[PDB]
Amino acid sequence: SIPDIKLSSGHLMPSIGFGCWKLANATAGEQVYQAIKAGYRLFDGAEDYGNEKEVGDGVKRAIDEGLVKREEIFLTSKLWNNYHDPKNVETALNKTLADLKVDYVDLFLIHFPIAFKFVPIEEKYPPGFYCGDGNNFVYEDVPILETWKALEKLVAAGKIKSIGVSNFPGALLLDLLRGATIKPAVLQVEHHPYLQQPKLIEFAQKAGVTITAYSSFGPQSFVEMNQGRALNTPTLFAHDTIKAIAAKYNKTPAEVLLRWAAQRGIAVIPKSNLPERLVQNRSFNTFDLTKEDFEEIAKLDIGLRFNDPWDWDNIPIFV
Amino acid sequence: SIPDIKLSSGHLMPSIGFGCWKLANATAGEQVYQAIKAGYRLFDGAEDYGNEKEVGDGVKRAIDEGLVKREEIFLTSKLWNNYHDPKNVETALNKTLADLKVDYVDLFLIHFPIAFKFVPIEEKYPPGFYCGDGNNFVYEDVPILETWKALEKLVAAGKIKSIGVSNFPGALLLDLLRGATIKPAVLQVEHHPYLQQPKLIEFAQKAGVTITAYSSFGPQSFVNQGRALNTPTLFAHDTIKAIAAKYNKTPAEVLLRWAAQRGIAVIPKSNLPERLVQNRSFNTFDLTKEDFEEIAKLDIGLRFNDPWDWDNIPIFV
Ligand SMILES: NC(=O)c1ccc[n+]([C@@H]2O[C@H](COP(=O)([O-])OP(=O)(O)OC[C@H]3O[C@@H](n4cnc5c(N)ncnc54)[C@H](OP(=O)(O)O)[C@@H]3O)[C@@H](O)[C@H]2O)c1
Ligand SMILES: NC(=O)c1ccc[n+]([C@@H]2O[C@H](COP(=O)([O-])OP(=O)(O)OC[C@H]3O[C@@H](n4cnc5c(N)ncnc54)[C@H](OP(=O)(O)O)[C@@H]3O)[C@@H](O)[C@H]2O)c1
Numbered sequence: 001s002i003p004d005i006k007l008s009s010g011h012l013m014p015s016i017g018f019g020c021w022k023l024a025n026a027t028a029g030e031q032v033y034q035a036i037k038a039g040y041r042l043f044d045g046a047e048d049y050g051n052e053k054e055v056g057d058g059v060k061r062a063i064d065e066g067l068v069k070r071e072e073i074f075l076t077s078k079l080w081n082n083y084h085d086p087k088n089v090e091t092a093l094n095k096t097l098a099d100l101k102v103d104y105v106d107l108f109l110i111h112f113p114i115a116f117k118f119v120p121i122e123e124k125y126p127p128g129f130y131c132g133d134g135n136n137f138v139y140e141d142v143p144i145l146e147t148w149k150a151l152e153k154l155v156a157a158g159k160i161k162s163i164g165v166s167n168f169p170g171a172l173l174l175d176l177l178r179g180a181t182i183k184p185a186v187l188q189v190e191h192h193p194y195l196q197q198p199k200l201i202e203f204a205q206k207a208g209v210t211i212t213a214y215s216s217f218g219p220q221s222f223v224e225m226n227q228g229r230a231l232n233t234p235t236l237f238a239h240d241t242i243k244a245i246a247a248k249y250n251k252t253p254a255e256v257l258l259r260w261a262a263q264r265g266i267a268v269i270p271k272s273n274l275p276e277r278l279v280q281n282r283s284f285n286t287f288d289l290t291k292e293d294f295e296e297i298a299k300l301d302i303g304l305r306f307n308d309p310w311d312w313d314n315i316p317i318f319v
Numbered sequence: 320s321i322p323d324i325k326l327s328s329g330h331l332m333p334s335i336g337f338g339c340w341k342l343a344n345a346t347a348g349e350q351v352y353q354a355i356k357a358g359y360r361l362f363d364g365a366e367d368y369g370n371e372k373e374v375g376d377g378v379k380r381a382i383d384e385g386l387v388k389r390e391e392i393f394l395t396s397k398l399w400n401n402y403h404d405p406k407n408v409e410t411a412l413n414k415t416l417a418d419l420k421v422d423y424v425d426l427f428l429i430h431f432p433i434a435f436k437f438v439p440i441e442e443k444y445p446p447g448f449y450c451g452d453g454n455n456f457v458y459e460d461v462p463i464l465e466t467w468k469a470l471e472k473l474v475a476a477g478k479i480k481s482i483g484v485s486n487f488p489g490a491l492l493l494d495l496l497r498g499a500t501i502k503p504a505v506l507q508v509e510h511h512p513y514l515q516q517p518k519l520i521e522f523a524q525k526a527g528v529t530i531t532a533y534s535s536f537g538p539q540s541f542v543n544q545g546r547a548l549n550t551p552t553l554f555a556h557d558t559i560k561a562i563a564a565k566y567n568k569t570p571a572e573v574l575l576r577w578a579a580q581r582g583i584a585v586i587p588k589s590n591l592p593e594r595l596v597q598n599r600s601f602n603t604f605d606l607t608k609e610d611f612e613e614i615a616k617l618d619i620g621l622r623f624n625d626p627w628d629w630d631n632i633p634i635f636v
Binding site: 113115140141142143144145168169170171172173174175177178179197199200202203206310314315316317318319 | 432434459460461462463464465487488489490491492493494496497498516518519521522525627631632633634635636
């Protein structure tokens with residue numbers, strides 16, 4: 001049912017996966033397991049999510065029960081900001097591998113083109129915004145390419161199958177493509193009708209980089225974090241454009257939001273604590289948005305970004 | 320008169336300069352010379368402008384006539400897109416030096432974070448968008464930092480006083496800063512009330528990078544581009560007029576002052592002598608917080624110089 005996408009690395013990646021951000025440690029293992037039973041095969045995690053051990057527990061349970069074999073699960077993780085210095089990259093990957101209880105991750109991404117000062121794992125993990133000095137942000141002078149070469153070596157050592165990046169704007173991705181020996185296979189970015197960045201999508205896809213969309217439901221994911229920008233934003237779920245299209249096909253607004261990306265070759269990783277939403281978030285490929293529908297949804301693009309490092313410490317990633 | 324700005328390199332840079340883009344070759348020498356007599360000391364040029372030889376004649380004439388000495392003139396040039404590969408960087412710079420008839424340039428900027436396939440100087444100069452294969456754009460795998468290191472080397476060789484970048488978005492500048500031994504001293508970007516990019520300015524200034532604004536008059540500079548032609552003029556914008564008529568200054572003087580008062584260098588260019596004068600003496604009034612607030616409302620992120628138009632190059636996306 002779930003179409004696979006061919007990555008530039010020579011490996012297949014499910015076009016629909018299960019998001020793990022803000023999956024409570026207490027119920028994550030069980031929800032990952034239920035997701036596998038519901039047919040999900042790709043799991044989008046990260047060291048920063050702090051629940052990789054639980055994600056691993058869920059996968060290991062499914063494997064121990066004979067529902068799936070390791071090779072049938074696509075595990076994505078992300079290298080956090082404090083670990084860009086080459087000498088720390090493998091250490092961070094090792095922690096991820098140990099927590100996930102596996103020998104390799106299918107996809108490992110540079111979480112952000114941001115290098116926080118290294119913080120020893122036994123000092124605090126996941127470190128979040130901690131940089132070794134109270135609440136102050138401290139950075140390291142590690143160019144992206146240095147981190148990328150450390151990742152390329154880990155691919156050669158068999159610990160990572162495919163490598164890619166997240167939160168990279170066009171000029172940065174373009175430059176990485178110039179110095180990379182193993183081209184980044186995936187660009188994972190915030191993508192929803194309020195932030196469509198059509199030119200980025202076009203450039204990346206023309207360059208052979210697969211797009212994975214995150215926060216496909218826009219502000220939704222951020223309101224529980226009490227983010228003001230998101231709370232002030234009208235939901236996509238109650239938006240007249242999305243609702244009119246959903247009604248026309250007799251689909252849910254969530255299905256239209258996910259299909260709007262899937263139909264354009266963009267991979268999705270919807271997240272949900274609700275069992276009822278598992279099947280739904282993975283079975284939306286039952287109708288086709290017309291040229292007209294796309295023109296209508298295109299009108300909602302306003303460049304509204306919910307995940308912006310500028311908010312953390314005026315980091316100029318998207319400026 | 321014209322305030323100087325101390326660059327992160329230690330060297331000083333006039334805050335008001337004379338732009339050389341489109342200065343016709345037949346009269347560029349004379350215009351640069353007249354500009355020097357008019358008080359200008361910084362000349363913003365580029366290999367791509369194709370008139371460095373003539374800009375050089377102008378400066379050489381002012382020096383031979385004893386109006387100025389080489390070290391009182393600040394020359395800026397820019398490394399064009401076909402010369403990013405380190406093995407070609409010095410070739411391009413040597414051509415700029417031979418053309419300007421100088422032993423070094425004061426500021427050498429990476430013109431665009433774009434690497435076109437190398438085309439020999441002898442094959443075509445300036446190459447412009449020609450990449451050695453008909454009208455097709457062809458690129459080279461040369462990371463920004465490799466080009467930068469070649470420039471740092473040319474600084475140690477004494478051929479360049481300060482180095483910097485142009486048309487670099489925030490993320491790219493941030494990354495270059497992590498790898499630079501000599502920090503880029505300047506960030507030259509399009510900057511006007513319709514494209515204010517305040518967060519980029521704030522980040523750059525805070526990192527110690529000096530901003531040089533170009534196209535200070537917005538749409539007035541690309542007018543045969545449709546985008547610019549179909550954009551309401553800033554010279555007739557109600558907010559600009561209001562502030563200009565409120566200080567008895569021209570709209571042009573308000574547009575330049577808005578940048579200058581914020582520590583941003585400007586490089587206006589006028590074929591007309593009167594304006595030539597106007598453009599170097601607009602620091603005769605201050606904008607109030609309220610003025611800035613009203614001007615800041617014009618920001619719509621409208622960009623006239625976008626590589627996306629050339630070949631869907633993702634520099635600003
Ligand atoms: N690399 C990065 O920077 C980055 C940043 C953010 C996210 N990501 C990744 O991408 C994933 C997805 O993004 P996200 O978690 O931010 O947000 P999302 O998937 O857009 O989140 C959807 C929000 O909508 C609700 N929801 C889920 N299915 C729904 C449905 N069918 N109908 C109505 N509401 C529904 C969920 O609530 P319930 O849980 O109560 O169902 C959740 O609060 C993450 O889990 C993570 O793996 C990566
Ligand atoms: N790095 C880059 O990518 C880049 C890109 C573009 C430009 N630049 C540099 O920055 C400079 C700025 O570009 P530009 O020359 O097109 O922009 P500009 O100097 O802002 O152009 C102003 C236009 O307005 C007119 N003008 C000048 N002064 C005036 C005044 N006081 N009152 C009314 N009209 C006035 C001029 O025509 P008249 O001559 O008839 O008065 C000129 O056509 C260039 O020369 C170049 O050195 C760099």
